[PDB]
């Protein structure tokens, strides 16, 4: 599923990302735009042989199992395919774990390059929520 901007803003708010670890809703919407273009089925292969899955591009080395990532530790991690659902619940749960890992949203390089410190409220501006 490809979300509209205001549609995703509403679902991320319903899924408790607004002010999760202090990060306002617009950071999360901005992060999805530059990571996945609001597409829950986005996949991108890295040089290292890992893959990033879904609306927030969760990495297969650390957080999900895709069966082909060299050096992945925990084979019982949630299948990376479950992070591609029209329902964002599983992706939101992984993102909350990642953002609590010690680096905040700096874990998302696209957020850091394009969203951090900018007018992120613009990504929820015009939205009913």
């Amino acid at each position: 599923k490809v979300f509209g901007r205001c549609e995703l803003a509403a679902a991320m708010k319903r899924h408790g990302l607004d002010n999760y670890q202090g990060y306002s809703l617009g950071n999360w919407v901005c992060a999805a735009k530059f990571e996945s273009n609001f597409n829950t089925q986005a996949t991108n292969r890295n040089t290292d042989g890992s893959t990033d899955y879904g609306i927030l591009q969760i990495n297969s080395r650390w957080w999900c199992n895709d069966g082909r990532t060299p050096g992945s530790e925990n084979l019982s991690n949630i299948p990376c395919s479950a992070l591609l659902s029209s329902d964002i619940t599983a992706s939101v749960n992984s993102a909350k774990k990642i953002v609590s890992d010690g680096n905040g949203m700096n874990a998302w390089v696209a957020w850091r390059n394009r969203c951090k410190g900018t007018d992120v409220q613009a990504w929820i501006r015009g939205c009913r929520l």
């Epitope: 899924h15 990302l17 002010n19 957080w63 925990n74 774990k97 609590s100």
Partner: antibody
Framework: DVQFQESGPSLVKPSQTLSLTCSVT????????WSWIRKFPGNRLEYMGY???????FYNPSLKSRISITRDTSKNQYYLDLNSVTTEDTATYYC???????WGQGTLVTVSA | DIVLTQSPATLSVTPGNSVSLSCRAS??????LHWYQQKSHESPRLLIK???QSISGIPSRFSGSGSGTDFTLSINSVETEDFGMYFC?????????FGGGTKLEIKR
């Protein structure tokens, strides 16, 4: 199968250091943060701290900088050190995952002379 | 630090009846509210995560709802084995914090 198990002294003198070990075992282990939680005799629960999957520590500011968490990923072990204890530190200490799925049995620790 | 208020601290209930346990947060915490059952001689048992999400192995009679500052744990057809302490815990903000607990006493 995932099991968290605490061990270490059940008795600590006032002003000394409370030290506990957690051993994480099973064939079902997932990438998670590793936490310490305690339960005071009056049923109050306090989230003491955790060490992230990446090894970054988080400490409850209430513990007034007396707390240290370290880990040894080669042993699937992690450690709590709590300095300068008082009778206020008598509690049931649990190791648990950050997801809350898996908690240890709990070890009663008494601070007393 | 976020304060969770579980009121009342004690509730007596007749088996087969329904019960709602309140957890109010001092600031909005979205859905970032988890429910624990604790019996003496045992570790806390996670019942509900993120306000409403089902946990595998937890009987269907357990459900949660709410968001922002107002959360409820519901038990439909309270059974005798449902005696014990019920704790809410927030994960929106470090330090994570727990409510005071609600003790469930079974009537007979």
């Amino acid at each position: 199968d995932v099991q968290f198990q605490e061990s270490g002294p059940s008795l600590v003198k006032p002003s000394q250091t409370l030290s506990l070990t957690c051993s994480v075992t099973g064939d079902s282990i997932t990438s998670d943060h590793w936490s310490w939680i305690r339960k005071f005799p009056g049923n109050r629960l306090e989230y003491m701290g955790y060490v992230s999957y990446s090894g970054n520590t988080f400490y409850n500011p209430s513990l007034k900088s007396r707390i240290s968490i370290t880990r040894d990923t080669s042993k699937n072990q992690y450690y709590l050190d709590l300095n300068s204890v008082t009778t206020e530190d008598t509690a049931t200490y649990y190791c648990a995952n950050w997801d809350g799925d898996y908690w240890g049995q709990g070890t009663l620790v008494t601070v007393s002379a | 630090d976020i304060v969770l208020t579980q009121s009342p601290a004690t509730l007596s209930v007749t088996p087969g009846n329904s019960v709602s346990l309140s957890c109010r947060a001092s600031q909005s915490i979205g859905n970032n509210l988890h429910w624990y059952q604790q019996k003496s001689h045992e570790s806390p048992r996670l019942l509900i995560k993120y306000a409403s999400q089902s946990i595998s192995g937890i009987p269907s009679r357990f459900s949660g709802s709410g968001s922002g500052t107002d959360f409820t744990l519901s038990i439909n057809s309270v059974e005798t084995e449902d005696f014990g302490m019920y704790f809410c815990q927030q994960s929106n903000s470090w330090p994570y914090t727990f409510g005071g607990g609600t003790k469930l006493e079974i009537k007979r």
